[PDB]
Design an enzyme around this catalytic site. Structure first.
Site, PDB file in Angstrom:
ATOM      1  N   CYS A  16       0.841  -1.170   0.000  1.00 40.92           N
ATOM      2  CA  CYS A  16       0.000   0.000   0.000  1.00 40.92           C
ATOM      3  C   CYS A  16       0.900   1.253   0.000  1.00 40.92           C
ATOM      4  O   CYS A  16       1.999   1.304   0.589  1.00 40.92           O
ATOM      5  CB  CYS A  16      -1.038  -0.007   1.165  1.00 40.92           C
ATOM      6  SG  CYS A  16      -2.019   1.531   1.482  1.00 40.92           S
ATOM      7  N   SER A  28       0.544   3.765   1.737  1.00 36.40           N
ATOM      8  CA  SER A  28       0.807   4.147   3.127  1.00 36.40           C
ATOM      9  C   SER A  28       2.063   3.494   3.706  1.00 36.40           C
ATOM     10  O   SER A  28       2.737   4.110   4.537  1.00 36.40           O
ATOM     11  CB  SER A  28      -0.379   3.860   4.024  1.00 36.40           C
ATOM     12  OG  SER A  28      -1.475   4.644   3.549  1.00 36.40           O
ATOM     13  N   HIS A  36       4.728   5.611   2.510  1.00 44.92           N
ATOM     14  CA  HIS A  36       4.730   6.860   3.256  1.00 44.92           C
ATOM     15  C   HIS A  36       5.583   6.747   4.541  1.00 44.92           C
ATOM     16  O   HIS A  36       6.104   7.758   5.029  1.00 44.92           O
ATOM     17  CB  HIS A  36       3.312   7.269   3.658  1.00 44.92           C
ATOM     18  CG  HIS A  36       2.460   7.772   2.557  1.00 44.92           C
ATOM     19  ND1 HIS A  36       2.935   8.259   1.350  1.00 44.92           N
ATOM     20  CD2 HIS A  36       1.126   7.970   2.542  1.00 44.92           C
ATOM     21  CE1 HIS A  36       1.917   8.723   0.651  1.00 44.92           C
ATOM     22  NE2 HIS A  36       0.802   8.552   1.348  1.00 44.92           N
ATOM     23  N   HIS A  75       0.475  -3.542   6.533  1.00 46.78           N
ATOM     24  CA  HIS A  75      -0.784  -3.499   7.137  1.00 46.78           C
ATOM     25  C   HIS A  75      -1.925  -4.075   6.315  1.00 46.78           C
ATOM     26  O   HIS A  75      -3.055  -4.081   6.811  1.00 46.78           O
ATOM     27  CB  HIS A  75      -1.094  -2.043   7.529  1.00 46.78           C
ATOM     28  CG  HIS A  75      -1.233  -1.140   6.351  1.00 46.78           C
ATOM     29  ND1 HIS A  75      -0.154  -0.683   5.614  1.00 46.78           N
ATOM     30  CD2 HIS A  75      -2.334  -0.695   5.720  1.00 46.78           C
ATOM     31  CE1 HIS A  75      -0.603   0.045   4.604  1.00 46.78           C
ATOM     32  NE2 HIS A  75      -1.911   0.020   4.635  1.00 46.78           N
ATOM     33  N   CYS A  99      -6.874  -3.553   3.250  1.00 45.46           N
ATOM     34  CA  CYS A  99      -6.725  -2.110   3.097  1.00 45.46           C
ATOM     35  C   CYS A  99      -7.301  -1.538   1.792  1.00 45.46           C
ATOM     36  O   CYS A  99      -8.369  -0.893   1.808  1.00 45.46           O
ATOM     37  CB  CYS A  99      -5.250  -1.677   3.149  1.00 45.46           C
ATOM     38  SG  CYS A  99      -5.346   0.157   3.117  1.00 45.46           S
TER      39      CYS A  99
HETATM   40  N1  LIG Z   1      -7.860   6.718   4.262  1.00 41.03           N
HETATM   41  C1  LIG Z   1      -7.309   5.499   4.335  1.00 41.03           C
HETATM   42  O1  LIG Z   1      -7.640   4.684   5.173  1.00 41.03           O
HETATM   43  C2  LIG Z   1      -6.237   5.144   3.464  1.00 41.03           C
HETATM   44  C3  LIG Z   1      -5.476   6.040   2.734  1.00 41.03           C
HETATM   45  N2  LIG Z   1      -4.520   5.647   1.821  1.00 41.03           N
HETATM   46  C4  LIG Z   1      -3.876   6.714   1.099  1.00 41.03           C
HETATM   47  O2  LIG Z   1      -4.536   6.833  -0.193  1.00 41.03           O
HETATM   48  C5  LIG Z   1      -3.613   7.317  -1.171  1.00 41.03           C
HETATM   49  C6  LIG Z   1      -3.642   6.411  -2.398  1.00 41.03           C
HETATM   50  O3  LIG Z   1      -3.027   5.175  -2.052  1.00 41.03           O
HETATM   51  P1  LIG Z   1      -2.719   4.166  -3.235  1.00 41.03           P
HETATM   52  O4  LIG Z   1      -3.915   4.073  -4.161  1.00 41.03           O
HETATM   53  O5  LIG Z   1      -2.152   2.996  -2.575  1.00 41.03           O
HETATM   54  O6  LIG Z   1      -1.576   5.004  -3.908  1.00 41.03           O
HETATM   55  P2  LIG Z   1      -0.910   5.084  -5.353  1.00 41.03           P
HETATM   56  O7  LIG Z   1      -0.900   3.759  -6.023  1.00 41.03           O
HETATM   57  O8  LIG Z   1       0.363   5.904  -5.203  1.00 41.03           O
HETATM   58  O9  LIG Z   1      -1.917   5.996  -6.199  1.00 41.03           O
HETATM   59  C7  LIG Z   1      -1.884   7.424  -6.175  1.00 41.03           C
HETATM   60  C8  LIG Z   1      -2.127   7.900  -7.588  1.00 41.03           C
HETATM   61  O10 LIG Z   1      -2.128   9.359  -7.555  1.00 41.03           O
HETATM   62  C9  LIG Z   1      -1.572   9.842  -8.751  1.00 41.03           C
HETATM   63  N3  LIG Z   1      -1.139  11.204  -8.549  1.00 41.03           N
HETATM   64  C10 LIG Z   1      -0.006  11.592  -7.902  1.00 41.03           C
HETATM   65  N4  LIG Z   1       0.052  12.899  -7.906  1.00 41.03           N
HETATM   66  C11 LIG Z   1      -1.034  13.379  -8.569  1.00 41.03           C
HETATM   67  C12 LIG Z   1      -1.543  14.645  -8.940  1.00 41.03           C
HETATM   68  N5  LIG Z   1      -0.845  15.665  -8.516  1.00 41.03           N
HETATM   69  N6  LIG Z   1      -2.639  14.758  -9.577  1.00 41.03           N
HETATM   70  C13 LIG Z   1      -3.424  13.698  -9.949  1.00 41.03           C
HETATM   71  N7  LIG Z   1      -2.980  12.399  -9.666  1.00 41.03           N
HETATM   72  C14 LIG Z   1      -1.816  12.274  -9.009  1.00 41.03           C
HETATM   73  C15 LIG Z   1      -0.491   8.819  -9.061  1.00 41.03           C
HETATM   74  O11 LIG Z   1      -0.013   8.893 -10.434  1.00 41.03           O
HETATM   75  C16 LIG Z   1      -1.072   7.493  -8.630  1.00 41.03           C
HETATM   76  O12 LIG Z   1      -1.670   6.712  -9.670  1.00 41.03           O
HETATM   77  C17 LIG Z   1      -2.211   7.380  -0.481  1.00 41.03           C
HETATM   78  O13 LIG Z   1      -2.066   8.727   0.029  1.00 41.03           O
HETATM   79  C18 LIG Z   1      -2.384   6.508   0.748  1.00 41.03           C
HETATM   80  O14 LIG Z   1      -1.504   6.745   1.827  1.00 41.03           O
HETATM   81  C19 LIG Z   1      -4.334   4.338   1.397  1.00 41.03           C
HETATM   82  C20 LIG Z   1      -5.101   3.401   2.132  1.00 41.03           C
HETATM   83  C21 LIG Z   1      -5.719   3.760   3.406  1.00 41.03           C
HETATM   84  N8  LIG Z   1      -4.444   3.538   4.598  1.00 41.03           N
HETATM   85  C22 LIG Z   1      -4.440   4.371   5.668  1.00 41.03           C
HETATM   86  C23 LIG Z   1      -3.472   3.858   6.522  1.00 41.03           C
HETATM   87  C24 LIG Z   1      -2.936   2.768   5.901  1.00 41.03           C
HETATM   88  N9  LIG Z   1      -3.508   2.627   4.644  1.00 41.03           N
HETATM   89 ZN   LIG Z   2      -3.260   1.011   3.321  1.00 43.06          ZN
END
Ligand SMILES: NC(=O)c1c[n+]([C@@H]2O[C@H](COP(=O)([O-])OP(=O)([O-])OC[C@H]3O[C@@H](n4cnc5c(N)[nH+]cnc54)[C@H](O)[C@@H]3O)[C@@H](O)[C@H]2O)ccc1-n1cccn1
Ligand SMILES: [Zn+2]
Ligand SMILES: NC(=O)c1c[n+]([C@@H]2O[C@H](COP(=O)([O-])OP(=O)([O-])OC[C@H]3O[C@@H](n4cnc5c(N)[nH+]cnc54)[C@H](O)[C@@H]3O)[C@@H](O)[C@H]2O)ccc1-n1cccn1
Ligand SMILES: [Zn+2]
Ligand SMILES: [Zn+2]
Ligand SMILES: [Zn+2]
Lengths: 374, 374
Positions: free
Chosen positions: A46, A48, A51, A67, A174
């Protein structure tokens, strides 16, 4: 015959920010009262978790992260009643103590025993079950799934169907539940609505799945990485936009496209600027914007409260609003009945030992979810 | 007869910011198609009117302000079907055109024909009905009630009960409906809940009225002016707190008072800092905060989005979320049926000619609502 004894196993330890994980032997103490020791089978990567490496999500180091996972109970501490040895389980990064004001509330899910708001990196009793090189190692959100064995508090584990495919259903721990819940339970997306989803990773794709399930008529995926668009369309985006293609800010572009703003918007990235953009793009009088992405540690956004005064609703949620211990087994059962698909999220599979390659895949933009197998 | 003729009459003209109103003769043009000319009977002094004087709320000057009022139809333009000469009416500072996406939405009330978002200070046709000393004078929110006669678009007027006491029901034109609906309709306050209300003016007191009506068990009034506490308790506050009495920030006080945060909080002042405090004081996983106060022009607040990520809902509303033309007549009927009180909001009743004195009372903290009588 490992019951009651320390287990030595391999885990991925993070000793320092911005460094690779170290796959090396750790000692895992046996479970104390109301604790559960789990042999991990599969864990997803994930954002996160990343992060933690980047310093975006601050939690004490050194740490065993992870997680999003599933495994098999190896043993239970004294007084455990909800799982037994041999049960398939999913660790719950958001616990469900069942006793706090949040657990008792019909809507709330962010149980007061969580280790996300002010992370300590311990078990509920303020101590660690992990030693590496003779040094104590922190836990992460009470789960610490990047280890062949972990110990979790009982309130941070759910028994799931004994026939569940663990290498798929780990995503219910998750990414899938977070995104899907954010659409179906937190936003409560309506039939015929127009949705905008910012970020088309594992979680944003799950949002899309949720919006499609709820009957949205239009689902606009937003990503700066246009490689993400094909899969977003596959799971229900009706159209995809890259902000880099436009001269105008994307909130203006989305407001135009939606003839005056969308019904529902989702920030599924973790940037301050896009949280404000996502709010602004929803319709000013009746729009709803949900923050899903985890923001950089201790940073404040800036916004004009007239965005709200006109009638917008802004909200956020952890784990899709789902009360975790109640929901996870139901989600599994529903997956087994083919009520939703997890394969579209799984782009790469690796053995646990290639965890750093998994992370490279995510950081490169190539993967959605990589599942690691123990 | 005055129908079809220019009326010369007395109005309170604001020629420039931070100056007293000038009471003098204006000329009021007769109503055009779909327009309604009203003889004002009573108008309240709302803080939003003072915000025009102070520059807090930007609208074109010179202006005839006033938006909380009631009067009697003098004449109607061609095509008007919803009122007739002699009808008691309340001007609607949020219109209800009935055709826009917002009017058609079941929750939305901030009709797209409003003059609040991007104030032009005109009639819907982009012209003005008022002249003074040869100069055109702007309208305010499509209402302009600080005048013996005004002209409004049909979508900005509601017919009310012929037996209405206009010197009371004028408050249904803003302050009462705005606060009451913020609690009952926007927040949807639940029975046995704990509410915190920031700002105990006419609108904050009406919020308290609504939270009481919705069955809140606890209603905490928050004001820096302790003179406002007695009336807040009379209308339902269970306890009042003055932030200046505490060494700790009031969000911390309110969180401890409510054993981990309130169910519902309301910002009813118009300050960026109290909007953030109000959000922060609601329970982190399931709390709801509603912004009611009008913030100073063009200023941004700063906040940490983790306040939302944990589960909080933040929203705002104009006019209590009430669809204005449907709701105002029902509100008057409910008042006539003793379903709520208005007298606790009225502290002063002055002739219209003492408008400035009414504003001095507001500014000095001495009044809740002053009603001006024509
Ligand atoms: N709320 C929760 O419980 C939660 C939160 N997170 C958080 O969600 C975000 C997304 O996680 P992800 O889908 O695993 O991440 P990526 O695969 O990196 O996808 C992100 C996506 O965004 C595009 N992107 C980057 N920058 C931009 C801009 N500027 N504009 C438009 N799009 C953009 C990328 O190209 C990419 O495809 C994360 O912040 C995450 O931390 C995940 C799950 C749960 N959590 C909470 C605690 C533990 N897990
Ligand atoms: Zn997560
Ligand atoms: N949303 C609408 O439709 C809306 C908005 N307003 C806005 O609401 C605020 C309150 O208006 P009021 O009740 O008419 O104002 P006052 O009588 O001045 O009461 C304010 C109250 O606040 C206290 N106070 C000042 N500073 C503090 C601090 N720092 N802490 C705690 N309390 C504090 C004062 O002592 C006083 O008692 C206004 O912003 C108003 O603009 C009203 C009505 C409708 N609206 C929209 C358009 C037209 N009308
Ligand atoms: Zn709990
Ligand atoms: Zn309308
Ligand atoms: Zn007002």
């Amino acid at each position: 015959s490992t019951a009651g004894k320390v287990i030595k196993c391999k885990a991925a330890v993070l000793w320092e920010e911005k460094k690779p994980f170290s796959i090396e032997e750790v000692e895992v103490a046996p479970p104390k009262a109301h604790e559960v020791r789990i042999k991990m089978v599969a864990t997803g990567i994930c954002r996160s978790d990343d992060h933690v490496v980047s310093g975006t999500l601050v939690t004490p180091l050194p740490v065993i992260a992870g997680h999003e996972a599933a495994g098999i109970v190896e043993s239970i501490g004294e007084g455990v009643t909800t799982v037994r040895p041999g049960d398939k389980v999913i660790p719950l990064f958001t616990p469900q103590c069942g006793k706090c004001r949040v657990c008792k509330h019909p809507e709330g899910n962010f149980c007061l025993k969580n280790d996300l708001s002010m992370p300590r990196g311990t078990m509920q009793d303020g101590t660690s079950r992990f030693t590496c090189r003779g040094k104590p190692i922190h836990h992460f959100l009470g789960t610490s799934t990047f280890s062949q064995y972990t110990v979790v508090d009982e309130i941070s584990v759910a028994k799931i169907d004994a026939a569940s495919p663990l290498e798929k259903v780990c995503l219910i721990g998750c990414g899938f539940s977070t995104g899907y819940g954010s659409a179906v339970k937190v936003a409560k997306v309506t039939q015929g609505s127009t949705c905008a989803v910012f970020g088309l990773g594992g979680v944003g794709l799950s949002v899309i799945m949720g919006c499609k399930a709820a009957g949205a008529a239009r689902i606009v995926g937003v990503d700066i990485n246009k490689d993400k668009f094909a899969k977003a369309k596959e799971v229900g985006a009706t159209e995809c936009v890259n902000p880099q293609d436009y001269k105008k800010p994307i909130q203006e572009v989305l407001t135009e496209m939606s003839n005056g703003g969308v019904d529902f918007s989702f920030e599924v990235i973790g940037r301050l600027d896009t949280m404000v953009t996502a709010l602004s793009c929803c319709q000013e009088a009746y729009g709803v914007s949900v923050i899903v992405g985890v923001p950089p540690d201790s940073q404040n956004l800036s916004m004009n409260p007239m965005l709200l005064l006109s009638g917008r609703t802004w909200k956020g949620a952890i784990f899709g609003g789902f009360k975790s211990k109640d929901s996870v087994p139901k989600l599994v059962a529903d997956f087994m009945a083919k009520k939703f698909a997890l394969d579209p999220l799984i782009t790469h599979v690796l053995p646990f030992e290639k965890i750093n390659e998994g992370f490279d895949l995510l950081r490169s933009g190539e993967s959605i979810r990589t599942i690691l197998t123990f």
